[PDB]
Structures are given as structure tokens and as C-alpha cells.
Amino acid sequence: AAAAMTATRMPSSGSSPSVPSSIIAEEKLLALLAELEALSRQLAALTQQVSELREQQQQ
Amino acid sequence: ALLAELEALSRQLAALTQQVSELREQQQQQNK
Numbered sequence: 001a002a003a004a005m006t007a008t009r010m011p012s013s014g015s016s017p018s019v020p021s022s023i024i025a026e027e028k029l030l031a032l033l034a035e036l037e038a039l040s041r042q043l044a045a046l047t048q049q050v051s052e053l054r055e056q057q058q059q
Numbered sequence: 060a061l062l063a064e065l066e067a068l069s070r071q072l073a074a075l076t077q078q079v080s081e082l083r084e085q086q087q088q089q090n091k
Contacts, residue, residue: 031084
């Protein structure tokens with residue numbers, strides 16, 4: 001009634017960026033698709049000359 | 060056997076222009 005009455009008396013907000021580091025970029029990209037063919041070409045050339053041992057030993 | 064030698068060369072000499080392209084692009088990627 002008196003004394004104190006003179007003054008006065010959720011779910012999901014879904015953030016995303018959190019506490020990780022900063023990020024950067026560059027545009028000098030992508031030789032790498034050539035080596036996948038270099039590697040599998042030269043791999044064949046190994047077997048090709050293993051065959052050239054065998055095809056001369058068989059003579 | 061000489062003809063299988065030219066065939067091994069057709070692979071192994073198609074590596075040189077490849078290594079040159081690689082050793083070129085690997086020198087683009089050192090500076091900005």
C-alpha cells in the first residue's frame with residue numbers, strides 16, 4: 001500500500017558468426033588438374049617399360 | 060622394339076611442356 005510504492009517495480013535468435021578467426025582470398029588459381037593427368041600418364045609409362053624388359057627377355 | 064621406344068617417347072616427351080607449364084605457373088604464384 002505505501003513506503004516502497006514511491007518509485008516503481010524466449011526460444012531462438014539464431015546467430016551464426018561465433019568466436020573464430022578472420023578470413024582472406026586470392027585469384028592465382030588451379031594448375032592442379034594437370035598433375036592428376038601427369039601422374040596417371042607417367043604411371044602408365046612405368047608399366048610400358050616394365051613390358052619392354054619382358055618383351056626383350058622373351059626373345 | 061624401336062617403335063615401342065617412339066611410343067615411350069610420345070608419353071615421356073609430353074611431360075616436358077607439362078613441367079614447363081607447371082614451373083611457369085609456380086612462378087606466377089610467388090608475388091602480389
